[PDB]
């Protein structure tokens, strides 16, 4: 069973701006998604200090970047806190609404899209490079879910029947036809070094084939 939901107006607006605005510095999407992963990893790590059993679903705290040229996808995988159904549908969206408002005000005042992260809505920078984003996530004490959106004002959530993840999140970027450079090892290495060099978790760039 697949449930379909409408984005709140502000998020739909944000996604349209990201998709429609001419802005060449698209590579910033990667640091934003890695920053989401890092924050998620911080969260499970801190929680585990008071409840060590929260790591029964996996001790290792890390990030993998997986390019797939056949599928034309770049996947960002982490073993962070993951997201409940409520996190996916309601709660992160509520925070993103107020973040969007501040971001759009800042843009009018002369800020640029690369500053999106300061407003807590950096996830949506995925749409600079992706025609569709799929999010597979597993939080402790909840089911594995798949969230998906190609924008257009709606997203879906279903319970996932793919490979079980233990705990964490996979963000699968179905890349735009003209954005396949982000499948190249050298290009990913370049971006991580430039923007994500001090992330406090191992980042493994998988190689193709
Ligand atoms: C930044 O803080 C947090 C991030 C996350 N996780 C994440 C959240 C997002 N994220 C954020 C910040 C906003 C949004 C998302 C993903 C979405 C599909 C729910 C759409 C959205 O509006 C993306 C990736 C992860 C990830 N890699 O785990 C979970 C949290 O707690 C369950 C949390 O603490 C509030």
From Swiss-Prot:
ISGylated. The modification N6-acetyllysine is found at residues 43, 69. ATP binds at residues 36, 78, 97, 123. Changing residue 32 to A: Strong ATP-binding. Strong interaction with HSF1, HIF1A, ERBB2, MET, KEAP1 and RHOBTB2. No effect on interaction with TSC1. It is found in: Nucleus; Cytoplasm; Melanosome; Cell membrane. Disulfide bonds: none annotated. Molecular chaperone that promotes the maturation, structural maintenance and proper regulation of specific target proteins involved for instance in cell cycle control and signal transduction. Undergoes a functional cycle that is linked to its ATPase activity which is essential for its chaperone activity. This cycle probably induces conformational changes in the client proteins, thereby causing their activation. Interacts dynamically with various co-chaperones that modulate its substrate recognition, ATPase cycle and chaperone function. The TPR repeat-binding motif mediates interaction with TPR repeat-containing proteins like the co-chaperone STUB1. Homodimer. Identified in NR3C1/GCR steroid receptor-chaperone complexes formed at least by NR3C1, HSP90AA1 and a variety of proteins containing TPR repeats such as FKBP4, FKBP5, PPID, PPP5C or STIP1. Forms a complex containing HSP90AA1, TSC1 and TSC2; TSC1 is required to recruit TCS2 to the complex. The closed form interacts (via the middle domain and TPR repeat-binding motif) with co-chaperone TSC1 (via C-terminus). Interacts with TOM34. Interacts with TERT; the interaction, together with PTGES3, is required for correct assembly and stabilization of the TERT holoenzyme complex. (Microbial infection) Interacts with herpes simplex virus 1 protein US11; this interaction inhibits TBK1-induced interferon production. This is Heat shock protein HSP 90-alpha. It comes from Homo sapiens (Human). The chain holds residues 16 to 224 of 732 of the full protein.
């Amino acid at each position: 069973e697949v449930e379909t939901f409408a984005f709140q107006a502000e998020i739909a607006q944000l996604m349209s701006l990201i998709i429609n605005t001419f802005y060449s510095n698209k590579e910033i999407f990667l640091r934003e998604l890695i920053s989401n992963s890092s924050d998620a990893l911080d969260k499970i790590r801190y929680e585990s200090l008071t409840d060590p059993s929260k790591l029964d679903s996996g001790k290792e705290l890390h990030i993998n970047l997986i390019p797939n040229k056949q599928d034309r996808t770049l996947t960002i995988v982490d073993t962070g806190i993951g997201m409940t159904k409520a996190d996916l549908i309601n709660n992160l969206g509520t925070i993103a609404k107020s973040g969007t408002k501040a971001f759009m005000e800042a843009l009018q005042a002369g800020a640029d899209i690369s500053m999106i992260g300061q407003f807590g809505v950096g996830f949506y920078s995925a749409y600079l490079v992706a025609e569709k984003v799929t999010v597979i996530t597993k939080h402790n004490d909840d089911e594995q879910y798949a969230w998906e959106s190609s924008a257009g004002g709606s997203f879906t959530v279903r319970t996932d029947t793919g490979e079980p993840m233990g705990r964490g999140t996979k963000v699968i970027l179905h890349l735009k036809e003209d954005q396949t450079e982000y499948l190249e090892e050298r290009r990913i290495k370049e971006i991580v070094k430039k923007h994500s060099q001090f992330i406090g978790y191992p980042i493994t760039l998988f190689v193709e084939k």
